[PDB]
Amino acid sequence: SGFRKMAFPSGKVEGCMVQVTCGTTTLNGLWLDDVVYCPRHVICTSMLNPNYEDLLIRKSNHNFLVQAGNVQLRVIGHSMQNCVLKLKVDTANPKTPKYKFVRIQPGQTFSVLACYNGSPSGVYQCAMRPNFTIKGSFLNGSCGSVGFNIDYDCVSFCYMHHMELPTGVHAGTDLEGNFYGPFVDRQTAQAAGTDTTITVNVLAWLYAAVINGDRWFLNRFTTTLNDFNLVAMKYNYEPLTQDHVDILGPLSAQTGIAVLDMCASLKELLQNGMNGRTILGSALLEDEFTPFDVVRQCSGVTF
């Protein structure tokens, strides 16, 4: 029993984190096989309208200092792919895990290994918000920290950290260096779009609550998908789709509560609040657990 914001074990990623210095700028990089991936804004000084092709043309391999733990790695090549810098090094990472690069959809969750000067600091879970930001915990020097999922023993990297927006939320790229969202890696007026709540995740979390013995919010009613989405839109919730309903199938089956039955509970909670009760220790509706996250944690899968 119990339900917690659970990250994946981070050891496989910790062995990949290095420090990348270029001039006076230091940040983190990801060392897989003989390549080190890091944000390209490492080659910047100050930055309002940087021309990165020019900035990189003016660099040489010896302008890049890469340290893995205590050993310095020799850079033997450098190139840029979108907003990521790729530094070829002379030695392949002996700790390289089985891995893949993936570009996730909004509403999906991942583990973040926050790092400073190439040294892991902590691990936490978060979600790609519908507005393509993440509500992380990042200080100066955290750029290059990665987000990931782990299936079987394969690490799927899905996020590298680049920037903190003025509202305190965070922007980054997939590991091919494509930003999530409309953002660009320069100092300009940038702001996240309006955000919405991830409906399918809230429902998943209600199922986890039921699985853990919180039932007070259940009712006998049912709603139509169309009637529910009318209420969703009113409270700034993402529309619920038949894909979402099918994804919730196994949780619906394990609890015996039909998805559209749970939607009637969610409607009431949106309309009437919680009246001083809590769900899974929260006074607010939680939306950073996917259906997969719930099944994993209430079923016990390992990696």
Add this chain to the structure above:
Amino acid sequence: SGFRKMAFPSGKVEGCMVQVTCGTTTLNGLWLDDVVYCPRHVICTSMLNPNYEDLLIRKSNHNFLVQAGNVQLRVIGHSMQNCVLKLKVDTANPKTPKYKFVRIQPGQTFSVLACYNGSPSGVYQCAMRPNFTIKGSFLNGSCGSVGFNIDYDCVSFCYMHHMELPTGVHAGTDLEGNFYGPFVDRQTAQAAGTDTTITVNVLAWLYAAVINGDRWFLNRFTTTLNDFNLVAMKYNYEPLTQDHVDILGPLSAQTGIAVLDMCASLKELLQNGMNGRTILGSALLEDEFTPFDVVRQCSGVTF
């Protein structure tokens, strides 16, 4: 910016987790140097009044199957210390970190690496509640999972998981096998004592909120320690001590808000609620961050 329930990177612990089988009972063990530590109830069948000295007298080394990843470890000795079984094995763990065993005080936090069949599943943060339980996330097979902190590169183990209580909370021991709280490792009528909120942690978390730009709960008032503890007791909060005030010193200094000034904020929040506002994304007062946790995460320390 940002504030998240952050666990320590778990790699150093992942390399220590093994599976320990005795008959039909399988659980996790912790492999440090040439010893494997696990809950002694692994040698039980069913268990209401087990006599563990007798149960262990009847065992031999070959009744214990220890698997580390894919390799089976040869048990060459066995003994019991309090509620922990210690199995001497023929091979010292080559991945043993620098480590220590520590017995923590209630209100202190730690990272939990949940494991099944010796394989890490996830990592999360929690606190030793004042009633010596933890609100973890554990399923059958999780016994033997450990809780830990990491300072510099030294892993301080402070919890091994033994049991789930009927209320869904969790009971365990230090790594010397002494239970936290009044619990015993047998099937009987056991229930946690009444719990209280960790006042010093709530104040620490209010400081983190201020550090991250949430100020709406601040006021111009101040309170006496005595007057505050009168309100604390009313709302089932632990008394605040001068030790607690001194521990909050650095957060008080960094924000310029005196501790007793923050206590007046907390008093108002206890009396008047939040009136539909949130702090650090929470509608409830959070009490599982220590002052040290706040400083670490709002200052950027690594391990």
